[PDB]
Write an enzyme that holds these catalytic residues in place. Structure first.
Site, PDB file in Angstrom:
ATOM      1  N   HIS B 222      30.768 -29.882 -51.775  1.00  0.00           N
ATOM      2  CA  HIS B 222      30.263 -28.522 -51.595  1.00  0.00           C
ATOM      3  C   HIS B 222      30.834 -27.958 -50.292  1.00  0.00           C
ATOM      4  CE1 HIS B 222      26.965 -25.385 -51.615  1.00  0.00           C
ATOM      5  NE2 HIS B 222      27.240 -25.422 -50.324  1.00  0.00           N
ATOM      6  N   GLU B 223      30.754 -28.739 -49.217  1.00  0.00           N
ATOM      7  CA  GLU B 223      31.282 -28.284 -47.939  1.00  0.00           C
ATOM      8  C   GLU B 223      32.804 -28.158 -47.988  1.00  0.00           C
ATOM      9  OE1 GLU B 223      29.537 -26.943 -45.695  1.00  0.00           O
ATOM     10  OE2 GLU B 223      27.743 -27.488 -46.835  1.00  0.00           O
ATOM     11  N   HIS B 226      33.723 -24.870 -49.440  1.00  0.00           N
ATOM     12  CA  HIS B 226      33.612 -23.813 -48.434  1.00  0.00           C
ATOM     13  C   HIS B 226      34.861 -23.868 -47.559  1.00  0.00           C
ATOM     14  CE1 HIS B 226      29.577 -22.296 -48.997  1.00  0.00           C
ATOM     15  NE2 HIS B 226      28.991 -23.451 -48.736  1.00  0.00           N
ATOM     16  N   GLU B 261      27.656 -18.622 -50.952  1.00  0.00           N
ATOM     17  CA  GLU B 261      26.941 -19.805 -51.430  1.00  0.00           C
ATOM     18  C   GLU B 261      26.850 -19.804 -52.956  1.00  0.00           C
ATOM     19  OE1 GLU B 261      26.196 -22.420 -50.003  1.00  0.00           O
ATOM     20  OE2 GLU B 261      26.229 -21.918 -47.869  1.00  0.00           O
TER      21      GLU B 261
HETATM   22 ZN   LIG Z   1      26.910 -23.995 -48.824  1.00  0.00          ZN
END
Ligand SMILES: [Zn+2]
Ligand code: NA
Lengths: 4, 422
Positions: B222-223, B226, B261
């Site tokens: 997830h990071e 990003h 997000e």
């Molecule tokens: Zn996030």
């Protein structure tokens, strides 16, 4: 970010 | 393997891939031991009291200021054994991610996503932005600058506040102008979150204790997603949010969630970003890429001796998948842009990683955290690159039993409950  | 060496924290520094380094925080710091696990990617087994000078205190000032969703322990990651385990845990997660086609694709995009050399005030010269490098202490004790794309570092005061951090520019918004910048991910493989298997329970702030544990590989992925958006300079401005109107508890508190997000989670969540704005963003970044192609065409000389102008021009031709004609003039192809933009924003998502890892995971970003657990994924008897906690050929192989904190209780220690505290 994982969040709430 | 993604990581060629199985580093030990106490391995002697060599000034190459095991070295004491300093980061360009525009401040004064003592060198910290870091490890280069892959081309353009480093791991710093330290709590992050560096990227932000205002966040150098690992202690909770009072005992009532911070949000319910937070966890403090000033001693975590202060010993060599902890750092050794941190390094090994992060390494294992990178391998788990890399072992999937999606993870290989994402990591490849990340390695290719070199922050653009847009630090020149003269359009005839190509210059690197010095905040996208780290200072490495060489064997002779001198410092040498090295460009890098990603750094995984320990969390700051709030242990569970995982996030992407990067140094800004005086004028340019590097994570939103197509340029990109070196990403610092505050992360820990030593803790994980608990969620609920029933949607009505997971999305309710008053129910559930956190029966299932989030696989840390998903959290890191997830990071990394990003990080990918940020390295390609297409992150969505955090001021662009979704005023949640699909959850009475979120709505009754005016809770808002950024499009960045929702995009990152993917699945049905991404649908909350309306088409008109989605196209607005796409056009915006499309233009930013055009400006980069334009800047490259104006470059008549490179600054430095690390590489040739032709090499760097080609590096960015490959990063942004630009088209090169006769005169070697660069341009952005609409089709190639849409494909790259989509890859980074729609293909690389949390929801898709869940499919690849075959793990149980929150069904939406719009839920309420239940708890935080202490874990240890380093031992193969606890967690593997191939199955995570759901070890094949054991009672943990089926029905996500490995993630079931009640069944696989020996692998989780609940540190704090969040339910009822929102
Ligand atoms: Zn996030
Ligand atoms: Na929260």
């Amino acid at each position: 970010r994982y969040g709430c | 393997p993604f990581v060629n060496k199985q580093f030990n924290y106490k391995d002697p520094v060599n000034g190459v891939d095991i070295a004491y380094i300093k980061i360009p925080n525009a401040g004064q710091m003592q060198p910290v031991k870091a490890f280069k696990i892959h081309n353009k990617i480093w791991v710093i087994p330290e709590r992050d009291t560096f990227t932000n000078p205002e966040e150098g205190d690992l202690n909770p000032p009072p005992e009532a200021k911070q949000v319910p969703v937070s966890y403090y322990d000033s001693t975590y990651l202060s010993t060599d054994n902890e750092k050794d385990n941190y390094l090994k845990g992060v390494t294992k997660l990178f391998e788990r991610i890399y072992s999937t086609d999606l993870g290989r694709m994402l990591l490849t995009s990340i390695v290719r996503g070199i922050p653009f050399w847009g630090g020149s005030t003269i359009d005839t010269e190509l210059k690197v932005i010095d905040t996208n490098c780290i200072n490495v202490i060489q064997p002779d004790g001198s410092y040498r600058s090295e460009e890098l794309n990603l750094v995984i570092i320990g969390p700051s005061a709030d242990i569970i506040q995982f996030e992407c951090k990067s140094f800004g520019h005086e004028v340019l918004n590097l994570t939103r102008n197509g340029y990109g910048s070196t990403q610092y991910i505050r992360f820990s493989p030593d803790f994980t979150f608990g969620f609920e298997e029933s949607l009505e329970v997971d999305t309710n702030p008053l129910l559930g204790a956190g029966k299932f544990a989030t696989d840390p590989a998903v959290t890191l992925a997830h990071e990394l997603i990003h990080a990918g958006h940020r390295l390609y300079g297409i992150a969505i401005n955090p001021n662009r949010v979704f005023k949640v109107n699909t959850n009475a508890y979120y709505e009754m508190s005016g809770l808002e969630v950024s499009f960045e997000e929702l995009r990152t989670f993917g699945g049905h969540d991404a649908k909350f970003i309306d088409s008109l704005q989605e196209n607005e963003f796409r056009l915006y970044y499309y233009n930013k890429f055009k400006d980069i192609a334009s800047t490259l065409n104006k470059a008549k000389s490179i600054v430095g001796t690390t590489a040739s102008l032709q090499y760097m021009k080609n590096v960015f031709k490959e990063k942004y998948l630009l088209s090169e004609d006769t005169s070697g003039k660069f341009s952005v192809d609409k089709l190639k842009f849409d494909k790259l933009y989509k890859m980074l924003t729609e293909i690389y998502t949390e929801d898709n990683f869940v499919k690849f890892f075959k793990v149980l995971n929150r069904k939406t970003y719009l839920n309420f955290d239940k708890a935080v657990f202490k874990i240890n994924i380093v031992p193969k008897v606890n967690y593997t690159i191939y199955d995570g906690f759901n070890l094949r050929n054991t009672n943990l192989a089926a029905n996500f039993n490995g993630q079931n904190t009640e069944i696989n209780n020996m692998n989780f220690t609940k540190l704090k409950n969040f339910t009822g505290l929102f």
